[PDB]
Swiss-Prot record, chain A:
NCBIfam families: rpmF_bact. GO terms for cellular component: cytoplasm; cytosol; cytosolic large ribosomal subunit. One of its GO terms (biological process) is response to radiation. HAMAP family: Ribosomal_bL32. The gene is rpmF. This is Large ribosomal subunit protein bL32. Keywords: Ribonucleoprotein, Ribosomal protein. Residues 1-37 are annotated as: Disordered. Belongs to the bacterial ribosomal protein bL32 family. SUPFAM superfamilies: Zn-binding ribosomal proteins.
Curated annotation (Swiss-Prot), chain B:
The gene is rplS. PROSITE patterns: RIBOSOMAL_L19. It comes from Escherichia coli (strain K12). This is Large ribosomal subunit protein bL19. Keywords: Ribonucleoprotein, Ribosomal protein, RNA-binding, rRNA-binding. Induction: Part of the rpsP-rimM-trmD-rplS operon.
Swiss-Prot record, chain C:
GO terms for biological process: cytoplasmic translation. Signal peptide: none annotated. GO terms for molecular function: large ribosomal subunit rRNA binding; structural constituent of ribosome. It comes from Escherichia coli (strain K12). InterPro entries: Ribosomal_uL14 (IPR000218), Ribosomal_uL14_bac-type (IPR005745), Ribosomal_uL14_CS (IPR019972), Ribosomal_uL14_sf (IPR036853). It comes from the Bacteria. SMART domains: Ribosomal_L14. This is Large ribosomal subunit protein uL14. Belongs to the universal ribosomal protein uL14 family. Binds to 23S rRNA. Forms part of two intersubunit bridges in the 70S ribosome.
Curated annotation (Swiss-Prot), chain D:
The keyword Ribonucleoprotein applies. The keyword Ribonucleoprotein applies. GO terms for cellular component: cytoplasm; cytosol; cytosolic large ribosomal subunit. One of its GO terms (molecular function) is structural constituent of ribosome. The gene is rplQ. This is Large ribosomal subunit protein bL17. Part of the 50S ribosomal subunit. Contacts protein L32. SUPFAM superfamilies: Prokaryotic ribosomal protein L17. Pfam families: Ribosomal_L17 (PF01196).
Length: 56, 114, 121, 120, 209
RNA sequence: GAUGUCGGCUCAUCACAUCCUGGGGCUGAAGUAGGUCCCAAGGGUAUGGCUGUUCGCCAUUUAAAGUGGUACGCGAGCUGGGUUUAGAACGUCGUGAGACAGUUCGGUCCCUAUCUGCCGUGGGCGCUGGAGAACUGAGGGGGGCUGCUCCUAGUACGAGAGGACCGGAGUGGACGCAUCACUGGUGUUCGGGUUGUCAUGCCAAUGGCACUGCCCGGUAGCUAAAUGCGGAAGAGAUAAGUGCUGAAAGCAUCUAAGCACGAAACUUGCCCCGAGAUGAGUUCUCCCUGACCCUUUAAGGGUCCUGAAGGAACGUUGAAGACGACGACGUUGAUAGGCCGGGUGUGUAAGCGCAGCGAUGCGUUGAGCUAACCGGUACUAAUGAACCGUGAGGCUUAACCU
RNA sequence: AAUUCCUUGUCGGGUAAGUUCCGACCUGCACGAAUGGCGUAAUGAUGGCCAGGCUGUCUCCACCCGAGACUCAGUGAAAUU
RNA sequence: CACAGGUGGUCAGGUAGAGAAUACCAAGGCGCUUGAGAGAACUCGGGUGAAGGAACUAGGCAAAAUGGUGCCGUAACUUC
RNA sequence: AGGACCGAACCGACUAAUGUUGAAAAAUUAGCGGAUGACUUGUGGCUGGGGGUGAAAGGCCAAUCAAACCGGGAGAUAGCU
C-alpha cells in the first residue's frame, strides 16, 4: 500500500494543523519564596506550597 | 448496598443451623408433586459452600440409584424449609470437588469428632 | 445435547453407548437436555435386548451433567448424561424399566410412563 | 477493559513487579526520601504504609511476616523500632510525594516520595 | 402517564410465598420536583421538567441556580423533560414521588449504557472467527472482506466494523414492577436494565402492552 | 512494461422469474391437505456422510432449506484441497529427447494504506453580544422470522376416517439488546498443598528460581452456557382482489359519475442518532451599563482603565476511555491512596504446651493471612493565585410604547 | 490396480448416511513375468482408511499473563510519485 | 551492521540425576546501547476453560495427550 | 557381535507457526531423523568449463550453472520496442 500521487506541500500543511504546540497556561509562584515554579510541584530548590521540603 | 442489604437482611432467614465442607445434612425441600405438596428430603454431603448473604448454597453430593447426583440449594429459599446435619466430618478443605472421583472406601471422610 | 455426544441408557434393552445424531425441536436448534426428544443411534446394545446396534430411533434426555434449575435458582445435576429410547412412530418409551433417578421436569402427560418408575424425583 | 480494576502493572510481569517494589520499599524505609517516577511512586505508597501500619505492633510474627515481604532484617528493624512508634499514632498517611517530574533521558515524570515525619 | 428519574444500584432477589426467587433491579426515586412546565403558548408542547438529586450548591452555575430559583429551587443532579398529555402540573416543585406508580405494571427504564469502548467486531457485532488453526495467517478474529469488487466500488454505509461499544441511552420496555414501596423511595422491577449503579435512569410506564 | 484460477472460509449487498410466513381468483376446492395463477422482497430460509468440488446422491432435521446479479461478489481479508513449474512412477504414444484436457506421491501464497470509501472519535470556525442548560424534531438508522400445545371445537364439514375457519391463551427454536442478582468460567494482584534446588549462620520459619515450577480453591471486574426484555396491537393509504348503486349499451356492468372494504410490502406506531436543519430553530436562567484620541468619517483604527457569566489549565480520579472526549472531586473535601470496622476467600498461622522413638497428631484455634468489595474516616495528596473570555449587542421595516 | 476412459462399474463390509477405504467379481479403454510377475517377516519424519485416548480443531467463544499496537521524550527509514 | 546465523581444540565443582539431559547453584561473566506511561481493537507467545468431544478440515493441521524404574503380563504373523 | 535398540554432544532437516521493507539474500521457536558408522570433523592436497565432480536432482563447481567468473573479438546481430 503506497501513495499513488505525491501529496502536495499544501495537503501536508493541513495535516500539520493540529501539530501546533501548546503554551503553559501561565505557571504559578511560591509564597515563602519568589520561586517561579510549576503548579503543584517543587520549586527550583526545595519549596512548593510555602514551607520548604527536600533539604537544600 | 446501604439501601440494599436491608431488603436482604429483611429476607434472610435466621432459622439455619451450622455447616462445614464435610457434614452430611438432610435438606428437606418442598415438591408439590401433583395435587399434593409433600416434603422431600435430601441426604448428601456438603462439598462447596455459600457465604454471600441472602444468596447462598451448599451443593450436596448424594448418589441415589447407583448414579451420583449433585444439588445446589439456595439456603434462603422458601423451598428449603428445614435442614438437618446428621453427621459432621473432618475435611481440611473448603471445596471437596475431589470427590466427584472417589466412591465408597475412597470417598470416605473421617467424621468431625470434637 | 448437540450432535454426536454419547449418552447412557436410562432404561433397558440395547443398553450402553447411544449417540445422538440430531437435536429435534426446530431449525438450528443447538442442544437439548431436561426432557427433550433426541434422535438416537444405538452404539452398544446388549446381545439380546429389544434393540441392537445400528438402530436409528428417538429418545428423551432424562439426565444431564449441566443439570436443571428451578425458580429459586437451586440447581440439580447428575454426573453423566442418561436418556430413554422411545418408539419412533408415536413417542412413549419402549423399555419395561427405568434405571436411575429422574427429574420432576418429566411430569408431563406424555413423559408420564417414566416418572412412574422406581427411582425418584 | 480495566473496569473497576485496582493495581498498576507498570510494564512487566508480576514476578518483576514485586521485587522492584520490594527494593524500592526498603529503599524508602532507609533514606526516608526517594526520587522515582510519579506513577512508580503513587504505587510504592500502598506498599510501605501497609508495612508501617504493620510496624505498629512489635509482635514476633508481624515481624517475621514483615520479613516475608521486603527480605531485609535491616529495615524490618527500622520498622517496629523507628517508623513503628514514629507513626504509632499516625492515622495512615505516612507518605508524601512532592512532584517535580521531567527526567533527562526520558521525559518521564519523577517525584519525591518521603515519610511525613522526615524533616528532621 | 409521566415517568420518574432514579438511580441504579439494584440487582437482588425477592422469594415468593410459593418459592420463587424473583430477580430485581432496585431503582431509587427520591421524588421529582417539577422545575418547569412547558405549554403550547410559550414552548409549543405540553411538557414538564423535573429534578430529583441535590447538587452540592457549589458546582452549580449561577445560570442554573437562577433557573431553580425561578421555580421551586432545590438543586439536583440535572434536568429532565417529561412529555405529558391531558393533565398538567403546578409550575412549582409539585414534588412527585415513586407513588406515581402502583397500579402501573408497565415501566421501561432507560439508563446510559455499559461502556465497552474497545469495540472490535465479534463482540459488538457478534461476528464469526476464522479457524484458529488449519493455517490462517494473522486473520483469526478479524473482519475479513468488507466489500465486493469493482461493480460496487465503495463500501456501503452501516457496514459493521469495530468502533466504540457502549455509552448510549437504550431502554428495556415491559419489565414487571415487583414493589413500588415509596417512603424509602424505592421501585423494584423484574431485573436487568442498563447502567452500572449510580447511573441516572428514566423509568416510565411502558408504551407497549 | 502482469486485471492471481476453481471450491472452502469471513463478510456481505441487490433483483424478483417467491422456498417459508402474509392477502387473493379458479379448482377435477367436503374437511384436513393440495393443484395452478395473481399480489407481495418485511423478515426468515439445515446439520452431517462421500468427494477439492460447485453440484450431486445419501442420513436426519425445518415453517422453509428459493433462483439469480454483484470481476461465475469477496487473496494489498484468510485457506491452497482441485488446477500449469522444476522431483518421481504407472497406463498409453514415440526409435528417442520427450508427450497426455489420463492417473499417481511430493511441491515457498509478499505489501507498515497516501487518495476514495466505510467504522469510530476529536480539533477549528459558523450559527451575528457572551454564557450554562432543557428541548423541538426536518430528516437518517435499527427492528420486522416463526413452531407447537390448549380453548373455541371433537364443533363446521363428513359415510365415516378425519377434521377446520374465525377469534383468543400459553410455551418454544433461531436472532437481537442489556445486565452479573442466580448457575457457572476466568481471576499469573487472595489463601493453601507440594516436587527439585539456592539462600536468609543453624533449628524453626521464610523468600528466589524451575510454564504462575506443578497443583487445589477463589474476591472484584469481565463474562455465556446464566438471567430479564424485545420483534406486537393499533392507525393511514393501498396491492391482487371483492365489491355497491350505475349509464353509455330498453338489460347487463366494480366505473364511465359516484361510494366501501382490502396484505409481513408503503406512511406511522416501537428503539437509537439527530439544528452544519448554513432553511444552523425554540424555551428557561446567568453576566458585562469607565474614560479618551487619531481619524483619509458610519468605516473605522488605536490608547489607558477594566476583565463578569462561564471556560480552560493544573491536581486527586472514574463501572469513561487508544489519544482527544465525557463524568466526579479540589480543604465551603470523601476525588484517589492509606487507615478503621465488616464481608468474602482460603482453611485452623507463628509461638508455646502436650502425646508419640519418629513421620506426625491434639490444644491454644476455626486460626492466620486476605484484592479491585461494603460502611466509615482528612492521616497523605487534591495551594492563593494565574490564563482565556469583556465593558450592553449592525442596518431596514412592522408591531406595539413614549 | 501408483494401470479402468464410461466411473461414484456391480456386490459384500464398515457408517444414521462412505465419489475415499477393505474384500470380491472380471466388461484388463490400455497388467504380466530381471525397461522383472505374484508374494513377503522386519523396517519407514513414505501414500490411503479406521478406532481408543485426547483435547478450544469445532459448536461458540470467555477470562487472564506477557511482546507490539496507543501516549510522551530522543533518533529516524521504505516502496511509490 | 556493535547482524538472534557460522566457527576447530582444551578444561569440567555442589545438590538431585543413568548422564557432558535437566532444574537450582560455585568460580566466573552478565541484564543483551532508546527509555517513561497506558492497560484499546487487532497481530504475536502463553495460562485456564461449563456441556459436548473431530460435529472442525482437503486432512485431527495445530493443539491436548503419552512419558520413569521394578515387577506381572502381552496377539496375528515370522526369515525364529 | 551388530550399516542392532533408547538418547546428549555431533551430524541432519519431516511438520507447524512466526518472519517475508526479516534479527537472517533460508533463519527463530516448538516438535522431528541418524547418533560405532556407506558416521562425523580439523589441516593440507588433486580433478577447470563442453571440462571437472555427481549413492543421479542437471545436482554442485565462491549468494552465479541445460555449460562458471574475468578480459578480449565488440559499437556481435536486433526485418523488434
Ligand atoms: Mg517465575
Ligand atoms: Mg506466511
Ligand atoms: Mg462510481
Ligand atoms: Mg410476481
Ligand atoms: Mg452438503
Ligand atoms: Mg470471482
Ligand atoms: Mg496475503
Ligand atoms: Mg494444490
Ligand atoms: Mg517431471
Ligand atoms: Mg469418520
Ligand atoms: Mg480393491
Ligand atoms: Mg509394467
Ligand atoms: Mg521392481
Ligand atoms: Mg510505536
Ligand atoms: Mg515519537
Ligand atoms: Mg548490541
Ligand atoms: Mg471444555
Ligand atoms: Mg468430518
Ligand atoms: Mg464440514
Ligand atoms: Mg501434529
Ligand atoms: Mg503439546
Ligand atoms: Mg544404530
Ligand atoms: Mg538414536
Ligand atoms: Mg579443507
Ligand atoms: Mg552456487
Ligand atoms: Mg567483429
Ligand atoms: Mg550492442
Amino acid at each position: 500500500a503506497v501513495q499513488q500521487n505525491k501529496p502536495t506541500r499544501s495537503k501536508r500543511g493541513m495535516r500539520r494543523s493540529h501539530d501546533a504546540l501548546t503554551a503553559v497556561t501561565s505557571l504559578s509562584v511560591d509564597k515563602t519564596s519568589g520561586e517561579k515554579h510549576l503548579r503543584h510541584h517543587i520549586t527550583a530548590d526545595g519549596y512548593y506550597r510555602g514551607r520548604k521540603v527536600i533539604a537544600k | 448496598s446501604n439501601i440494599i442489604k436491608q431488603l436482604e437482611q429483611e429476607q434472610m432467614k435466621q432459622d439455619v443451623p451450622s455447616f462445614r465442607p464435610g457434614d452430611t445434612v438432610e435438606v428437606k425441600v418442598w415438591v408439590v408433586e401433583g395435587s399434593k405438596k409433600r416434603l422431600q428430603a435430601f441426604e448428601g454431603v456438603v462439598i462447596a459452600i455459600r457465604n454471600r448473604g441472602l444468596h447462598s448454597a451448599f451443593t450436596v453430593r448424594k448418589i441415589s440409584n447407583g448414579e451420583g447426583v449433585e444439588r445446589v440449594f439456595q439456603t434462603h429459599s422458601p423451598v428449603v424449609d428445614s435442614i438437618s446435619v446428621k453427621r459432621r466430618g473432618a475435611v481440611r478443605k473448603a471445596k471437596l470437588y475431589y470427590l466427584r472421583e472417589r466412591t465408597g472406601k475412597a470417598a470416605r471422610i473421617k467424621e468431625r469428632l470434637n | 445435547i448437540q450432535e454426536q455426544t454419547m449418552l447412557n441408557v436410562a432404561d433397558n434393552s440395547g443398553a450402553r453407548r447411544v449417540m445422538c445424531i440430531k437435536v429435534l425441536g426446530g431449525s438450528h436448534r443447538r442442544y437439548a437436555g431436561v426432557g427433550d426428544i433426541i434422535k438416537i443411534t444405538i452404539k452398544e446394545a446388549i446381545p439380546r435386548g429389544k434393540v441392537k446396534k445400528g438402530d436409528v430411533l428417538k429418545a428423551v434426555v432424562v439426565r444431564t451433567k449441566k443439570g436443571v434449575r428451578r425458580p429459586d435458582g437451586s440447581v440439580i445435576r447428575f454426573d453423566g448424561n442418561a436418556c430413554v429410547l422411545l418408539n419412533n412412530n408415536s413417542e412413549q418409551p419402549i423399555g419395561t424399566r427405568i434405571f436411575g433417578p429422574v427429574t420432576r421436569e418429566l411430569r408431563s402427560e406424555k413423559f408420564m410412563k417414566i416418572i412412574s418408575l422406581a427411582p425418584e424425583v | 477493559m480495566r473496569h473497576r480494576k485496582s493495581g498498576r502493572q507498570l510494564n512487566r510481569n508480576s514476578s518483576h513487579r514485586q521485587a522492584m517494589f520490594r527494593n524500592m520499599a526498603g529503599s524508602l524505609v532507609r533514606h526516608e526520601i526517594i526520587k522515582t517516577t510519579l506513577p512508580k511512586a503513587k504505587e510504592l505508597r500502598r506498599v510501605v504504609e501497609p508495612l508501617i501500619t504493620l510496624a505498629k505492633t512489635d509482635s514476633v510474627a508481624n515481624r517475621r511476616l514483615a520479613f516475608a515481604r521486603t527480605r531485609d532484617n535491616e529495615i524490618v528493624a527500622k520498622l517496629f523500632n523507628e517508623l513503628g512508634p514514629r507513626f504509632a499514632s499516625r492515622a495512615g498517611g505516612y507518605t508524601r510525594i512532592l512532584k517535580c517530574g521531567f527526567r533527562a533521558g526520558d521525559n518521564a515524570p519523577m517525584a519525591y516520595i518521603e515519610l511525613v515525619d522526615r524533616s528532621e | 402517564m409521566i415517568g420518574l428519574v432514579g438511580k441504579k444500584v439494584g440487582m437482588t432477589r425477592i422469594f415468593t410465598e410459593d418459592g420463587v426467587s424473583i430477580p430485581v433491579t432496585v431503582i431509587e426515586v427520591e421524588a421529582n420536583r417539577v422545575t418547569q412546565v412547558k405549554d403550547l403558548a410559550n414552548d409549543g408542547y405540553r411538557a414538564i421538567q423535573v429534578t430529583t438529586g441535590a447538587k452540592k450548591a457549589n458546582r452549580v452555575t449561577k445560570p442554573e441556580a437562577g433557573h431553580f430559583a425561578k421555580a421551586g429551587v432545590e438543586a439536583g443532579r440535572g434536568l429532565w423533560e417529561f412529555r405529558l398529555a391531558e393533565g398538567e402540573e403546578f409550575t412549582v416543585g409539585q414534588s412527585i414521588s415513586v407513588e406515581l406508580f402502583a397500579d402501573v405494571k408497565k415501566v421501561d427504564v432507560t439508563g446510559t449504557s455499559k461502556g465497552k469502548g474497545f469495540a472490535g467486531t465479534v463482540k459488538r457485532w457478534n461476528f464469526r472467527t476464522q479457524d484458529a488453526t488449519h493455517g490462517n495467517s494473522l486473520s483469526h478474529r478479524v473482519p475479513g472482506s468488507i466489500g465486493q469488487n469493482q461493480t460496487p466500488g465503495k463500501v456501503f454505509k452501516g457496514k459493521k466494523m469495530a468502533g466504540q461499544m457502549g455509552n448510549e441511552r437504550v431502554t428495556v420496555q415491559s419489565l414487571d414492577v415487583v414493589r413500588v414501596d415509596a417512603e424509602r423511595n424505592l421501585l423494584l422491577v423484574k431485573g436487568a436494565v442498563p447502567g452500572a449503579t449510580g447511573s441516572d435512569l428514566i423509568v416510565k410506564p411502558a408504551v407497549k402492552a
